[PDB]
Amino acid sequence: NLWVTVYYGVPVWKDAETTLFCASDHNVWATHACVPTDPNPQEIHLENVTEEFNMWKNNMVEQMHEDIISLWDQSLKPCVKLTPLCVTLQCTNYAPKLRSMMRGEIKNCSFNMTTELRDKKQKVYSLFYRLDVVQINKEYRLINCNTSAITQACPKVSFEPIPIHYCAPAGFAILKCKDKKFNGTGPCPSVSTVQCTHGIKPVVSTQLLLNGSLAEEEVIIRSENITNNAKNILVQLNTPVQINCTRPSNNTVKSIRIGPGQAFYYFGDVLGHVRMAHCNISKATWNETLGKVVKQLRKHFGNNTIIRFAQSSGGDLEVTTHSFNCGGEFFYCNTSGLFNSTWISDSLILPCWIKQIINMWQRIGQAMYAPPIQGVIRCVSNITGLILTRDTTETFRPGGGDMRDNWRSELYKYKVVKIEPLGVAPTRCKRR
């Protein structure tokens, strides 16, 4: 008695993987090449729709990772190649009479450098940080010479993490999860649909996450598998912790020509005093913050389980220290003063240092030379989350290195689906 009726424009969908396009309103990220923006990013609440999300299988994350690496390489590709600098350097100590923390940190080195004409060389003096050079047995080489050529980042291109929005192509839609206390997987009942995501700042850091979103109510602890020690634990804070970082040294930047239209920028000298780079964290805020984290960890591990935080265990600086880009300098900070406790039921200073030879995203084989920043640096940001790993007690240590987790912490709310507007159902009519 019933007949097949065909309906086109039916509001249904399937999980799908597609290419998203970006939009934003030079910079390292090619923000000028990414500008089909939307002043009115309408959001439609879907009543009575429950969808299953899985942030660990979210291909939006993999795309974001690839797009960032690609933009970085394009923007810093057409710059000066510092292949003439892979030479033997003759170095001494910059401030040999210094009795401070910086004793031995800055080297004063000489080079036989190329110049505009191929027939001549010039003698150049410059300062280097200890972590950028290797003694070869006086008698130093730049550390990158061991594996790769190094390119000078263009001085005209900013490292500021300008927000990027990801937008769906026609035929696709992005769904927000929007439940409170959403732990990354499962059935949010508060789902809404958008054309394009909010802007995400491509902030790159290890150990602690900076300048991201905050949890709405309480600290949320997420993991692919909370009982698997091979996995990382991503902790989203419901309050910011303000961190103030500085480079308390007034530096002078010098430059020379090293070829036909090519110039090298370097750390010339230091005016005033030589002081160690560092970051200030409110002592009370940090202790409160961990207390909240522990309270939530006990939900998975027991309220009679002792929880302790501990110092990072080893590997290179991108995994043993906190790292970030402030004012263009690349800082590495010792977080051992933070992750030191044991929980059972004024300010803190992280010493830091900087280095100019940077290997981004484990891309061994491609080094970047960060030109020095003139003057002094002050940078203020908040900690919005942290990455932890695990060894009748549990031991938690800071994690990092794989940048996908930094992006998982912003994209956990979204999934992409394909719209499939065609279907059938029985009705009572026969065409003719």
Binding site: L2, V4, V6, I44, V49, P169, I419, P426
Partner: protein, 120 residues
């Protein structure tokens, strides 16, 4: 409402928002490929629908009877007490059968029309 606003509502109610959904289906290499693919997808659905004898219609009915084996859960039970997202699972294994029948009971119609128009 707006695009997908009726997704959580009943099949009957949602049948009134087909226009809204239809208008949002259709509007450097990776992005260009995505646009080309979206067009090819769109055209495949339009071709298929046209083959079945359903051209510019958002709603059209045909001469293929509903089989009771195809999840024939009553009638008001689905139009008033079910959403399209649920219906899409109830009959997910029968869509290829149904589509084949829809194509067949069209080609037969075209031949009958061609013969009737040949009578003087």
């Amino acid at each position: 409402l707006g695009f997908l606003g009726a997704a959580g509502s009943t099949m009957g109610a949602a049948s009134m928002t087909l226009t809204v959904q239809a208008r949002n289906l259709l509007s450097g290499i990776k992005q260009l490929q995505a646009r080309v693919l979206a067009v090819e997808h769109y055209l495949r659905d339009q071709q298929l629908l046209g083959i079945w004898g359903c051209s510019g219609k958002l709603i059209c009915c045909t001469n293929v009877p509903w089989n009771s084996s195809w999840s024939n859960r009553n009638l008001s039970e689905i139009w008033d007490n079910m959403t399209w997202l649920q219906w899409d699972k109830e009959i997910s294994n029968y869509t290829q059968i149904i589509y084949g029948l829809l194509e067949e009971s069209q080609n037969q119609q075209e031949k009958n029309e061609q013969d009737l128009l040949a009578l003087d």
